[PDB]
Design a protein around this ligand. Structure first.
Ligand SMILES: OC[C@H]1O[C@H](O[C@H]2[C@@H](O)[C@H](O)[C@@H](CO)O[C@@H]2O)[C@@H](O)[C@@H](O)[C@@H]1O
Ligand SMILES: OC[C@H]1OCC[C@@H](O[C@H]2O[C@H](CO)[C@@H](O)[C@H](O)[C@@H]2O)[C@@H]1O
Length: 350
């Protein structure tokens, strides 16, 4: 029955990426090495090349305290779960790409096991995998609930699993309705595979309100850590988004993050940079979410190192190939402990 102000919050979801590899464990320094994206407005014949994922040159503007780690290393996973405990983030929202490979399956099991040791829960963030559609989504939801639903770390809210659906707008509401209306042709409602389905609110209310209603989503999130990147990721809209959610029986889970920078992998994307300012950016965004009066908050991200949105500890590093950004006047674990601060403020408000 403790009341220490240190406990995990199970309405706080932190987006987690399990796609990092090491040569030793995975055969390649996966994701630390990454293709550089061509400029979509830069014309033909670009040869942007690749970041090689050497110790000196990784696919991030920051540098992990844990180095070029493997997401399959149980010892890294232990450390990450201890970081979630420090942050008070009770739910790990795991990227899920439907890779259909044994190394994926192994990783997911390792993450569930490590999470449970620290009473962390896991939900899935369903990514835009090839030919994703409501039929294979249903099949995959069935598979995930069947495989993992009895694992003690599998997240439930009032008895239901929860999924975040990235880029949900890539599927028409008429298709979503088949899966998510109680009357839908292939409904999950009232079945063993029912779940809270949280779609991505992107653009203006004139588009998103009917999308969400007609698709029969249970709620919506915003993902992007960069303020103003979309209507949904503009925090001054969050009070009105929450009002609409409450009026329509939907769960709004705004996404907050500490900054954004992706110019190692997208050199042309500098206008999306959002400076961390020693934590002031994160504070401002988190405060807006709490002030909007929401029931749940998502954090972009634990470890999306390519996009510079991570709260995972980063260290100063200057190599012969790149001078990395770092947490400046703040210590490496600052964003974990600042997350814990905001989780406490959120709980005080709840
Ligand atoms: O700024 C780049 C942006 O790229 C990716 O987002 C793309 C797509 O998935 C989003 O739905 C739309 C929203 O308007 O933007 C892009 O086309 C993500 O990797 C994102 O975090 C990143 O900022
Ligand atoms: O988890 C939702 C999205 O989060 C942002 C990253 C995005 O993946 C794309 O971008 C990354 C680079 O940041 C690439 O490594 C991926 O292959 C993908 O293009 C997630 O979908």
């Amino acid at each position: 029955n403790n009341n220490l102000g240190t406990e995990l919050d199970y309405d706080t979801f932190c987006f987690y990426y399990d796609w990092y590899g090491s040569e030793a464990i995975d055969g390649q320094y996966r994701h630390w090495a990454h293709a550089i994206a061509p400029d979509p407005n830069g014309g033909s014949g670009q040869n942007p090349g690749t970041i090689p994922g050497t110790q000196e040159s990784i696919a991030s503007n920051f540098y992990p305290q844990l180095g070029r780690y493997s997401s399959s290393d149980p010892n890294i996973l232990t450390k990450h779960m201890d970081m979630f405990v420090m942050a008070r983030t009770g739910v790990l929202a795991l990227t899920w790409w439907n890779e259909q490979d044994e190394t994926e399956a192994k990783r997911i099991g390792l993450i569930l096991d490590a999470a449970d040791k620290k009473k962390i829960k896991v939900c899935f963030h369903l990514e835009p995998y090839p030919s994703r559609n409501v039929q294979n989504l249903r099949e995959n939801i069935v598979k995930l609930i069947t495989r993992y639903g009895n694992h003690p770390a599998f997240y439930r809210k009032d008895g239901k699993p929860l999924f975040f659906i990235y880029d949900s707008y890539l599927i028409e509401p008429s298709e979503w309705e088949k899966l998510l209306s109680p009357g839908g042709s292939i409904t999950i409602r009232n079945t063993a595979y029912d779940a809270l389905m949280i779609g991505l609110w992107t653009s203006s209310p004139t588009v998103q309100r009917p999308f969400i209603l007609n698709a029969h989503f249970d709620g919506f999130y915003t993902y992007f850590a960069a303020t103003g990147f979309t209507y949904g990721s503009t925090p001054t809209n969050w009070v009105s988004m929450q009002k609409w959610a409450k009026e329509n029986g939907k769960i709004f889970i705004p996404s907050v993050g500490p900054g954004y920078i992706d110019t190692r992998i997208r050199p042309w994307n500098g206008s999306v940079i959002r400076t961390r300012t020693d934590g002031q950016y994160y504070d401002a965004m988190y405060r807006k979410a709490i002030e909007a009066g929401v029931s749940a908050i998502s954090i972009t991200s634990f470890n999306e190192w390519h996009e510079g949105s991570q709260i995972e500890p980063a260290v100063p590093y200057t190599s012969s190939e790149f001078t990395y950004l770092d947490y400046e006047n703040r210590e490496p674990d600052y964003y974990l402990t600042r997350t814990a601060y905001w989780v406490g403020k959120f709980r005080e408000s709840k």
